[PDB]
Amino acid sequence: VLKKNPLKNKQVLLRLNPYAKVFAAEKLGSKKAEKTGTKPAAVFTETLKHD
Amino acid sequence: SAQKAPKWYPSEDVAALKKTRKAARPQKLRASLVPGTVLILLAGRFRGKRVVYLKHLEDNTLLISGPFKVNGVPLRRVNARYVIATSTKVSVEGVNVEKFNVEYFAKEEIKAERVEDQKVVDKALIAEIKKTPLLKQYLSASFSLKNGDKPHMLKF
């Protein structure tokens, strides 16, 4: 009789999609990606800053 | 007959209500409303009166008093959304106030108990007020908007 927005009614959010509970519990929406440091070839940098 | 009469009548059975889902949960008050805080009364009989806040009652109202001997306002209920909570604050650790609830204002002039309750509270408070100079005078004088005052700007 009345459509309820999962995006802003936590109950039906958890009704569709049970993963919402664990997503939120594991923050997950702010995941810290692996810190790696590959550096680009000077080819790349040269031609980026070329004329 | 003047008019035929229908083939169908309504039942006159009232239905029952659907079982509603509306829990009465408690009113958390805005942070500026701690007891001891001085309120400006925005409306009502004692509008623009400056007044000490004492207790949050169970009907959400606020218990205030003048004190009565200062500015003539008695122990009273006031509605939180008609009230500017100032930033100036008396301690209220010496004011009992337990006694005071909704039933205490059951309509049903003035009861001697009220007149005495008023005195016991007000004395604790006055004792306190006197600690900070000019507060009493403050408390005893109506607030108003002076030309140029811009509420959405002033700090209270």
């Binding site: 927005n5 995006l7 569709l16 999609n17 049970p18 993963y19 664990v22 995941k31 590959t38 680009p40 | -």
Partner: protein
């Protein structure tokens, strides 16, 4: 007569399995998506390290909004706008990109705005404005059994299964996407950018492929 709780038991328990299945499935896709996204990120970087260039695959899925009202429209575009189910302004549908639809898009550019939608805007499109076609009618999604009922034949028994089919352009995208009733957006909240809609995006207008800038818009209309 039993049943009371007896066949209430046969079912609530049965319902519980089904959620578990969804719980592990939606947990799956989360992995699916992250490591997909990350792999591309690492692709780019790996190729730069190597003095090369990682050119992403072209997008296989777009999202079209009809942007033009209903009158004064040539017949060829018209038909197409119907076949893509855009028959009123600000309504939108998903389209799988191949040569044979790509041309269709080409044909209606003056009248639409379209682009590559993100996971985020497909999710919020589906969660809020997403309705099924069920012996016609157009039924809100809002419970997962509505989907399993009609889309379950194809795998697909949750609102997130739906989203997952769309975004990855699954083997059963036709059924999954046709099931979706044309989304009905409001006009953009922020406004349109632009003072005139009916030039191409590129010329300061609103229509055409505007690529990843389609999410900014759709969100303001969803």
């Amino acid at each position: 007569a039993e049943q009371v709780a007896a066949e209430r038991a046969a079912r609530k328990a049965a319902n519980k399995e089904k959620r578990a299945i969804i719980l592990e499935r939606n947990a799956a896709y989360q992995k699916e998506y992250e490591t997909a996204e990350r792999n591309i990120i690492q692709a780019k970087r790996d190729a730069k390290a190597a003095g090369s260039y990682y050119v992403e695959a072209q997008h296989k899925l777009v999202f079209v909004v009809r942007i033009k009202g209903i009158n004064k429209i040539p017949p060829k575009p018209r038909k197409v706008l119907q076949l893509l189910r855009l028959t009123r302004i600000n309504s939108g549908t998903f389209v799988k990109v191949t040569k044979a639809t790509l041309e269709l898009l080409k044909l209606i550019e003056p009248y639409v705005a379209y682009g590559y939608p993100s996971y985020s805007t497909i999710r919020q499109l589906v969660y809020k404005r997403g309705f099924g076609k069920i012996n016609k009618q157009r039924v809100p999604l809002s419970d997962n059994a509505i989907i399993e009922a009609n889309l379950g034949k194809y795998g697909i028994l949750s609102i997130d299964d739906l989203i997952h089919e769309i975004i990855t352009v699954g083997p059963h995208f036709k059924q999954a996407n046709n099931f979706l009733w044309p989304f009905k957006l409001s006009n953009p909240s922020g406004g349109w950018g632009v003072p005139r809609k009916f030039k191409h995006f590129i010329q300061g207008g609103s229509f055409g492929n505007r690529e990843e800038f389609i999410n900014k818009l759709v969100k303001s209309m969803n």
